[PDB]
Every structure is written in structure tokens, then in C-alpha cells.
Amino acid sequence: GGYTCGANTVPYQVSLNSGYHFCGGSLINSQWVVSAAHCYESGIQVRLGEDNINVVEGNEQFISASKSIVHPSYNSNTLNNDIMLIKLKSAASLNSRVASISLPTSCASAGTQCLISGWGHTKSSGTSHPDVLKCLKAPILSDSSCKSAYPGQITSNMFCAGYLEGGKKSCQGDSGGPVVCSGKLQGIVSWGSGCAQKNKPGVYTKVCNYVSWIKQTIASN
């Protein structure tokens, strides 16, 4: 059922704001954020150090995005390759409440526990969500169970995490938000029925497939 994370306990969590909070993301170094390609839009301000997104509480850093880079192979219909990089106009000041999260060196396996965090905003969904950061500890599901949950839709660039029993909904992640497992960013909140229906898993972009692209893109921009 998840829980309130606690202010600044997820220091890599970011809010993307274009007048209002519209997506999450993950700080991966002082000047770059990873999010979902379906989060793309103009005039992004990156908000770090947030807990309540409607109240200035004292640990925020607001930094304009200088550049967004959608994956070359992003398909908005299938959500294959749902990943985007956002460069910050200035480097964030890193401390205990604002910190980067490591990229994976290896992919994660079914059964591994992950932390999904966010304010529960699914972009363009029109759905209600809280103003403080929420968290869910959830396991990665097997390939076969993921495909069985979403026949014909799961590519090699996606994985499922969450619960197939319990009779609850999981609405913690924002579009573009982090799935962190054993201190590595393994997933990005992409799509699924995990919030709309009970007993369904979320679907996440499989970050480990993109580490080479992320590193090369950052190194050149």
C-alpha cells in the first residue's frame, strides 16, 4: 500500500515543472536528469530537494532545463524506448538532501526489491494525486508474468514491478519517476494499469539497456 517517504529521504527525486508539476525524474549527476520520453515538453524547470510541491520548505533548488534529449528510437504509441535526458542550465549543489543516483552496471533480476517514489502524477491523465512524496517497496516481476499481465506489449526494453495480489492500486510513481534497486536506477515509470486497476504491475523503462547511450550523450552535450 506504500507510505509517505519523509521529506528529502529520496535525494535524487526531482519534480519537472512547466507551471505545475507534470512528471518526475532522477538526478544522475550534478547537471543531468533522466526521465520518460513521454514527459517531453517545452519550458521545463527542474525542481530538486522537494517534498511538498506546493509549499517552499527550505531545501529546494529550482533550475531551468537547458536541453532535453528524447531517445532516438522513442515510439509514443508503444512506449518502446521511453527515456529522455534533461540537462540543467547550472549544476545543482549536491548535499545529503540533493544527491545523484548511480546508473546500473548490470540489469536487475525478478524478485529484487525496488523503491518506487513520486507524487503520483501520470502525465495527461487528469487523475488526483498527493502533494508530498510517496514511496512503495515492490519486487521486480518475472519476464513471463510481466508479459502475461500485458500480452503483446512488453518489449525487451521494459520490465514490470509491483503486486498481483492484495487488492490495492499503486499510484506512487509519477510519469518519468525513479525505480531504484540496491542503489541503482533500474527503472523509469512508463505506463501500465498498476494505478488504475488493483492487482496490476507497473511497467518501467529498463534503464540498464540505455547506460551506453546515456553516458555517450552526456559526454557530448
CB of 172 to Ca ion, least distance (A): 18
Nearest to 53 by CA among 12, 25, 98, 14: 14
Backbone breaks in the chain after residues (C–N over 2.5 Å): none
Number of amino acids touching Ca ion (CB under 5 A):
3
User: For residues 64 and 85, what is the distance between their CA atoms, to the nearest angstrom?
Assistant: 14
Q: Could you tell me if 142 and 123 are in contact, meaning their C-beta atoms sit under 8 angstroms apart?
A: no
Closer to Ca ion by Cβ: residue 50 or 82: 50
Compose the 167-186 pattern: x for residues touching Ca ion by CB under 5 A, - for all others: --------------------
Residue 8 grid cell: 528529502
Residue whose C-alpha cell is 491523465: 125
Buried-exposed string 102-120: b where 16+ CB fall within 10 A, e elsewhere:
ebbeebbeeeeebbbbbbb
Q: Which of 15, 170, 175, 190 is catalytic?
A: 175
CB of 60 to Ca ion, least distance (A): 5
Touching Ca ion, residues 40-59 (CB under 5 A): 50, 52, 57
How distant, in Å, are the alpha carbons of 58, 157, 202 from that of 182? 29, 20, 19
Q: Which of 51, 82, 100, 170 is catalytic?
A: 82
Known catalytic residue at 106 = no
Known catalytic residue at 125 = no
Closer to Ca ion by Cβ: residue 63 or 85: 63
3-state secondary structure of 38: helix
Closer to Ca ion by Cβ: residue 57 or 143: 57
3-state secondary structure of 148: helix
Position 83, amino acid: I
CB of 58 to Ca ion, least distance (A): 8
Closer to Ca ion by Cβ: residue 55 or 164: 55
CB of 189 to Ca ion, least distance (A): 20
Known catalytic residue at 38 = yes
Compose the 55-84 pattern: x for residues touching Ca ion by CB under 5 A, - for all others: --x---------------------------
Closer to Ca ion by Cβ: residue 52 or 95: 52
Residues annotated catalytic, as ranges:
38, 82, 175
Residues within the interface to Ca ion (CB under 5 A): 50, 52, 57
